Enzyme design. Structure first.
Site, PDB file in Angstrom:
ATOM      1  N   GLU A  84     110.531 134.209 122.773  1.00 11.20           N
ATOM      2  CA  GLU A  84     110.218 134.512 124.168  1.00 11.20           C
ATOM      3  C   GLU A  84     110.797 133.433 125.110  1.00 11.20           C
ATOM      4  O   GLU A  84     111.228 133.735 126.246  1.00 11.20           O
ATOM      5  CB  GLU A  84     108.699 134.664 124.316  1.00 11.20           C
ATOM      6  CG  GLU A  84     108.093 135.913 123.638  1.00 11.20           C
ATOM      7  CD  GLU A  84     108.687 137.240 124.106  1.00 11.20           C
ATOM      8  OE1 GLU A  84     109.099 137.328 125.277  1.00 11.20           O
ATOM      9  OE2 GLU A  84     108.756 138.218 123.307  1.00 11.20           O
ATOM     10  N   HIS A 136     104.587 148.625 122.110  1.00  8.58           N
ATOM     11  CA  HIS A 136     105.801 149.218 122.694  1.00  8.58           C
ATOM     12  C   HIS A 136     105.658 150.712 122.931  1.00  8.58           C
ATOM     13  O   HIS A 136     106.194 151.176 123.936  1.00  8.58           O
ATOM     14  CB  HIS A 136     106.980 148.861 121.798  1.00  8.58           C
ATOM     15  CG  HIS A 136     106.994 147.433 121.371  1.00  8.58           C
ATOM     16  ND1 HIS A 136     106.186 146.963 120.358  1.00  8.58           N
ATOM     17  CD2 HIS A 136     107.711 146.375 121.800  1.00  8.58           C
ATOM     18  CE1 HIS A 136     106.403 145.669 120.188  1.00  8.58           C
ATOM     19  NE2 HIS A 136     107.334 145.295 121.063  1.00  8.58           N
TER      20      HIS A 136
HETATM   21 ZN   LIG Z   1     111.350 139.759 123.005  1.00  8.08          ZN
END
Ligand SMILES: [Zn+2]
Ligand SMILES: *[C@@H]1O[C@H](CO)[C@@H](O)[C@H](O)[C@H]1NC(C)=O
Ligand SMILES: *[C@@H]1O[C@H](CO)[C@@H](O)[C@H](O)[C@H]1NC(C)=O
Ligand SMILES: *[C@@H]1O[C@H](CO)[C@@H](O)[C@H](O)[C@H]1NC(C)=O
Ligand SMILES: *[C@@H]1O[C@H](CO)[C@@H](O)[C@H](O)[C@H]1NC(C)=O
Ligand SMILES: *[C@@H]1O[C@H](CO)[C@@H](O)[C@H](O)[C@H]1NC(C)=O
Lengths: 593, 197
Positions: free
Chosen positions: A354, A484
C-alpha cells in the site's frame, strides 16, 4: 483550433478541488461509519457527478480526430468518457444507496458461535484471526458458513440490483456491459504495435493462465497431501481442497498454510512474525521500515500529512471502521493509508504494498489531472509488490535483524522461501482469474440468476480446484463476501499484477547487476533501480502502458517467462513431491455436502 | 534619519492581497532593520538577487518596495527572474535585472479553513503576458474562441480562480505568504539605510 488545452486547463483546476472534497467525505466514512457521514458522502458524490456530467458533454463537442497532441488526445478521450455521468438522477443515488448498504454490511457484519451463542464476532479484526490460526474443521466450518449465511445472504438482492444499474451505466458509455467497462482499462492508443484493444485481455489472460497452469497444479497436489495429514477424512486424495481450509476466509492466499506445509520444518523460519512479536514491533515501526526501504532505492519519504492523517491502528475510540488495506490519493498532495495493521509478517508486506501505491501517486503528480493514474490497474498494484519481492528475500530479512543472522543458507531454505512465495503468489492466480471470469459472465448475461451459485462453485471446482463444504442455493451470494466484489473494485488487476512483477523485478535486477537466481535478488540500496522505476512511474497514464512496459522491461505485453523462471527450483522439487500423486483435481467426491 | 523602517507591518498583517491584485508598500525614509522579518522566520524561500540576506542591515538605497500576496507552495518557484507559469505570466512578473529578495513562509494555520478559503484568487487566463511589475485586476470573461462571448459560458471562461485552502492539503497546495523586497538606486540621496552601513 485547440481551445482544448484551455478547456482542459479550467477543468483540471475545478475537478481537483471537487475530487478532494469527494475523497475526504469517503475517507471520513471509511474511518467513522455513521448515518451522518454516509449521507455527507452521498452529497459529495452527487456534486462530483453533477459536475462531471456537464464537463463530459462539454468535451464531447471537441472532435478527437482534430487533436494531434496525443497527450491532449488522451486527456480529451478520458474526459469524453462519462463514467457515472452515464447513470442519472434516481439511478445514480439508487446505485449509491445500494453501494453504501453493501459496504456497511460488509464492515459491520457479525456472526455468532453455536457453541457460545453470546459470542458474535466481526471479520475485519477477529474472524480473520480464526481463519488464520485454527485447524479445527468444525470451527473453521461454522465461521465460513456463518459468514456466507449471515452476510452473503444479506448481499444477494443488492448484488442483483447493482448488476442491472452498473450494466446500464456501461451501456450508456458504449460498452457491451460493466465487464467491458472494467476491461477498458487495458485499452491504449499509441502507434506501430503499441495499441491494445479491450478484447485482447481475455485472450492474453487465457494464454498466460495455461502457461501458469502446470505449476499451480503441482503446488495444488502437494498442498492437498499435507492437508490430508491434518484433515484425513474430509479431503479426497484425488479431488478438491475444501474452501474453508485455506489461508483466509476465501481461498485467496494460501499464506497461512506455510505452517502446515513448510518443506523442511527444521530450519530458519521464512515467516518472521514470532520475531516481530518478541522484537516489540508496532504499526509505526512497520511503516517506518517500508519508508526506509523506499528511500534506500531513492524514492521520497512520506509526507507529514501521511503520518498525521492516515489510519494505521484500528481505532479504539468506539469508532466502527472498514479495515481492508487501502492507499488513498485524495488529489492534493493529501496522501493517506487506511489499514488496521496488526503485528505480523503479512501486514509488514502489505504495508510495503500500500505504500508502493502511495509512492506511485506521489510519482505522477506532475501529470495533468486526467492523466494521474497508473498505466493500467495492474501496474499500480504491481509496483506495490515489486518492492515486496525484495523486502521478503531472506537476505534482507537478515539485514533487518528479524532473521537470526547465522548463515544457514542452502537450497533447503531457498525451497522453504519459494514455497512461502508460491503459497501467496501462485496460489492466488486461479482464484483471481476464476473470480473475475465469473463476474465477466454475470455482466455479459451468460449466467441466469437461478444458477448464480451453481456456476460459482462449478467454476470454483473446475478452475481453482476448490470445492464447497456445505451446499449453497441461490439464496447465497458468496462471491460478494469479498471486499472487492461488494465494494465495487475491479479484480483482474491482481492477476496482471502478479505477472507484470517478475517482468519488472527481472529488469530491475539486471540494472542492479544482481548475478544469479532472480529470487535471491534484492534491490535495496540500489539507486539506479529506483531511478529505472521512477522514470516510468512519472509517466502514469500519459503514454501507452505497452510502451511504458518496453521502457523498463522490453515487452509490449505480459510474459509468463520471468514468473516461471523465478519459481523454477520449487517446480522441480514439487514435481518430485507429486511423482506418486495425481497432479489435478476431479469435481466428483464431496465433503458429505 | 533615526526612525526605524516599518518592515514588520507588511509581514504582520491579518490578510494578504490575492496574487492577481498584489499589494505594494513604499518604504521611504528610515533606517532599515531586516531583523524583524525573522519574527516570521520559518521561511520556505529566502532568495536574494543583487544583494545578500547576510548583508541586509548594510543596504543603503534610495527606496524600498514591499510587494505582498498569497500563493501555492508549488508556485513560489515562479516568483523569480525569468520564470514561466500562470503566476508569473498573468499575476506577478519580475524584471530580469531584479535587485531584491523574495521571502516566502507557510501560512496554513491562518489562510486555510476546513471549508476552503475561496477569498484567495489568481488570474488563470490572459490574452498575453504581463510585463515586469505589471498589475491587472480585470474580471472580463476570457474569450477562447474566434466566436463572441457571454458570462462564464463556453469558449468563454471566467478569468480568475480560487485556491481551496484546507489544512489536510499536501504542502505544495497549502497557502504561502510572499514578500518581494525591491531595492531602488535612484539618483537622489539614499534614505533607506541600514544599521551597519
Ligand atoms: Zn493494492
Ligand atoms: C464521527 O461521526 C460522527 C457522526 O457522524 C461525528 O459527529 C463525529 O465527530 C465523528 N467522530 C470523529 C471525527 O472521530
Ligand atoms: C501538448 O500540450 C502540452 C500542454 O497541454 C504541451 O506542454 C506540449 O508541448 C504539447 N505537445 C506537443 C505540441 O506535441
Ligand atoms: C543496505 O544498507 C544498509 C545500511 O548499512 C544495510 O543495513 C543493509 O543490509 C543493506 N541492504 C542489503 C544488504 O540488502
Ligand atoms: C502588528 O503591529 C501592530 C502595531 O500596533 C499591533 O497592534 C498588532 O497586534 C501586530 N500584529 C500582531 C499579530 O500582533
Ligand atoms: C494592502 O494595502 C492596504 C492599504 O491600506 C493595507 O492596509 C493592507 O494591510 C495590505 N495588505 C497586504 C498585507 O497585502
Amino acid at each position: 483550433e485547440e481551445l482544448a488545452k484551455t478547456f482542459l486547463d479550467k477543468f483540471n483546476q475545478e475537478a481537483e478541488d471537487l475530487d478532494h472534497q469527494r475523497s475526504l467525505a469517503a475517507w471520513n466514512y471509511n474511518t467513522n461509519i455513521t448515518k451522518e457521514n454516509t449521507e455527507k458522502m452521498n452529497e459529495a458524490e452527487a456534486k462530483w457527478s453533477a459536475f462531471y456530467e456537464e464537463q463530459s458533454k462539454l468535451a464531447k463537442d471537441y472532435p478527437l480526430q482534430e487533436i494531434q497532441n496525443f497527450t491532449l488526445k488522451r486527456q480529451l478521450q478520458a474526459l469524453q468518457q462519462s463514467g457515472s455521468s452515464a447513470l442519472s438522477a434516481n439511478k445514480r443515488e439508487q446505485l449509491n444507496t445500494i453501494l453504501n448498504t453493501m459496504s456497511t454490511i460488509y464492515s459491520t457484519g457479525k456472526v455468532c458461535n453455536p457453541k457460545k451463542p453470546q459470542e458474535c464476532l466481526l471479520l475485519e479484526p477477529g474472524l480473520d484471526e480464526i481463519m488464520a490460526n485454527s485447524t479445527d474443521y468444525s470451527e473453521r466450518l461454522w465461521v465460513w458458513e456463518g459468514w456466507r449465511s449471515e452476510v452473503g445472504k444479506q448481499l444477494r438482492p443488492l448484488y442483483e440490483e447493482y448488476v442491472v444499474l452498473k450494466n446500464e451505466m456501461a451501456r450508456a458509455n458504449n460498452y457491451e456491459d460493466y465487464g467491458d467497462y472494467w476491461r477498458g482499462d487495458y485499452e491504449a492508443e499509441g502507434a506501430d504495435g503499441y495499441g491494445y484493444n479491450r478484447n485482447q485481455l481475455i485472450e492474453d489472460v487465457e494464454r498466460t493462465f495455461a502457461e501458469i497452469k502446470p505449476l499451480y497444479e503441482h503446488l495444488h497436489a502437494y498442498v492437498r497431501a499435507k492437508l490430508m495429514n491434518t484433515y484425513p477424512s474430509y479431503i479426497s486424495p484425488t479431488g478438491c481442497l475444501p474452501a474453508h481450509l485455506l489461508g483466509d476466509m476465501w481461498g485467496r492466499f494460501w499464506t497461512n498454510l506455510y505452517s502446515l506445509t513448510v518443506p523442511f520444518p527444521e530450519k530458519p523460519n521464512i515467516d518472521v512474525t514470532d520475531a516481530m512479536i518478541n522484537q516489540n514491533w508496532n504499526a509505526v515501526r512497520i511503516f517506518k521500515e517500508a519508508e526506509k526501504f523506499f528511500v534506500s532505492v531513492g524514492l521520497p519519504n512520506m509526507t507529514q500529512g501521511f503520518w498525521e492523517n492516515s489510519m494505521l491502528t484500528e481505532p479504539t475510540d468506539g469508532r466502527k471502521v472498514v479495515c481492508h488495506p487501502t492507499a488513498w490519493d485524495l488529489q492534493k498532495g493529501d496522501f493517506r493509508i487506511k489499514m488496521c495493521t496488526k503485528v505480523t509478517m503479512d501486514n509488514f508486506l502489505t504495508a510495503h504494498h500500500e505504500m508502493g501505491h502511495i509512492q506511485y501517486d506521489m510519482a505522477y503528480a506532475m501529470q495533468p489531472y486526467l492523466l494521474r493514474n497508473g498505466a493500467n490497474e495492474g501496474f499500480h498494484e504491481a509496483v506495490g509488490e515489486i518492492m515486496s519481492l525484495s523486502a521478503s528475500t531472506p537476505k534482507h530479512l537478515k539485514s533487518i535483524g528479524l532473521l537470526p543472522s547465522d548463515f544457514r543458507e542452502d537450497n533447503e531454505t531457498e525451497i522453504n522461501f519459494l514455497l512461502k512465495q508460491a503459497l501467496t503468489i501462485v496460489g492466488t492466480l486461479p482464484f483471481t482469474y476464476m473470480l473475475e471470469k465469473w463476474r465477466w459472465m454475470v455482466f455479459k448475461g451468460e449466467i441466469p440468476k437461478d444458477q448464480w451459485m451453481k456456476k460459482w462453485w462449478e467454476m470454483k471446482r473446475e478452475i481453482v480446484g476448490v470445492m464447497e463444504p456445505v451446499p449453497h442455493d441461490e439464496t447465497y451470494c458468496d462471491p460478494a463476501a469479498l471486499y472487492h466484489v461488494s465494494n465495487d473494485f475491479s479484480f483482474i488487476r491482481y492477476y496482471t499484477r502478479t505477472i507484470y512483477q517478475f517482468q519488472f523485478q527481472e529488469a530491475l535486477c539486471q540494472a542492479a547487476k544482481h548475478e544469479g537466481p532472480l529470487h535471491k535478488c534484492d534491490i535495496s540500496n540500489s539507486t539506479e533501480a529506483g531511478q529505472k522505476l521512477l522514470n516510468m512511474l512519472r509517466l502514469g497514464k500519459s503514454k501507452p502502458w505497452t510502451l511504458a512496459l518496453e521502457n523498463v522491461v522490453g515487452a509490449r505485453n505480459m510474459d509468463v517467462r520471468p514468473l516461471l523462471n523465478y519459481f523454477e527450483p520449487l517446480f522441480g522439487w514439487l514435481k518430485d513431491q507429486n511423482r506418486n500423486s495425481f497432479v489435478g483435481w476431479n469435481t466428483d467426491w464431496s465433503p458429505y455436502t | 534619519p533615526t526612525n526605524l523602517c516599518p518592515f514588520h507591518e507588511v509581514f504582520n498583517a491579518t490578510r494578504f492581497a490575492s496574487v492577481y491584485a498584489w499589494n505594494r508598500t513604499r518604504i521611504s525614509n528610515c533606517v532599515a532593520d531586516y531583523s524583524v522579518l525573522y519574527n516570521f522566520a520559518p521561511f520556505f524561500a529566502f532568495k536574494c538577487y543583487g544583494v545578500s540576506p547576510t548583508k541586509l542591515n548594510d543596504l543603503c538605497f534610495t527606496n524600498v518596495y514591499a510587494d505582498s500576496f498569497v500563493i501555492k507552495g508549488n508556485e513560489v518557484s515562479q516568483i523569480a527572474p525569468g520564470q514561466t507559469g500562470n503566476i508569473a505570466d498573468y499575476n506577478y512578473k519580475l524584471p530580469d535585472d531584479f535587485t531584491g529578495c523574495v521571502i516566502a513562509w507557510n501560512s496554513n494555520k491562518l489562510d486555510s479553513k476546513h471549508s476552503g478559503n475561496y477569498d484567495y484568487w489568481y488570474r488563470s487566463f490572459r490574452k498575453s503576458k504581463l510585463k515586469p511589475f505589471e498589475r491587472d485586476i480585470s474580471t472580463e470573461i476570457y474569450q477562447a474562441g474566434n466566436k463572441p462571448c457571454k458570462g462564464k459560458g463556453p469558449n468563454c471562461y471566467f478569468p480568475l480562480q480560487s485556491y481551496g485552502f484546507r489544512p489536510t492539503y499536501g504542502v505544495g497546495h497549502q497557502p504561502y505568504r510572499v514578500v518581494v523586497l525591491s531595492f531602488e538606486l535612484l539618483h537622489a540621496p539614499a534614505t533607506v539605510c541600514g544599521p551597519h552601513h
